């Protein structure tokens, strides 16, 4: 438990591109909990095959919409606070 329970349930309003991303893997809402956002990101990552083959906890998102949104070419799925930081730039808490 890296992230406070209440923060994980924060109601959030993705910005237009993050929203676009989430809907492209089947999300149907305008607002989400952070847990839900993470669910659809997981789907996105797996379908777009962005995991590194050798280091399966590393996501290579360079040249992908995800990389544009997060502002980085790669990250570790083990660093939740870092991921949250990157996600927060792409939404607003309601």
Ligand X SMILES: O=C1O[C@](O)(Cc2ccc(Cl)cc2)C(c2c[nH]c3cc(Cl)ccc23)=C1Cc1ccc(Cl)cc1
Which residues make up the interface to ligand X (CB under 6 A)? 38-39, 41-42, 45, 77, 80, 83-84
CB atoms under 10 Å from CB of 20, counted, come to 13
Contacts of residue 75, Cβ cutoff 8 Å, sequence gap at least 6: 58, 59, 61, 82, 83, 86
Q: Which one-letter DSSP state was computed for residue 58? A: E
Q: How far is the CB of 11 from ligand X (least distance, A)?
A: 17
Q: How far is the CB of 49 from ligand X (least distance, A)?
A: 13
Q: Which is nearer to ligand X, 23 or 39 (CB)?
A: 39
Contacts of residue 8, Cβ cutoff 8 Å, sequence gap at least 6: 33, 34, 35
Q: Which is nearer to ligand X, 13 or 72 (CB)?
A: 72
Q: How far is the CB of 23 from ligand X (least distance, A)?
A: 16
Q: Which is nearer to ligand X, 18 or 45 (CB)?
A: 45
């Amino acid at each position: 438990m890296q992230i406070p329970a209440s923060e994980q349930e924060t109601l959030v309003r993705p910005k237009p591109l993050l929203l676009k991303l989430l809907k492209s893997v089947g999300a149907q809402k305008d607002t989400y909990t952070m847990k839900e956002v993470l669910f659809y990101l997981g789907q996105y990552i797996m379908t777009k095959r962005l995991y590194d083959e050798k280091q399966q906890h590393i996501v290579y998102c360079s040249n992908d919409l995800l990389g544009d949104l997060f502002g980085v070419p790669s990250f570790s799925v083990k660093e939740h606070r870092k991921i949250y930081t990157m996600i927060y730039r792409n939404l607003v808490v309601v």
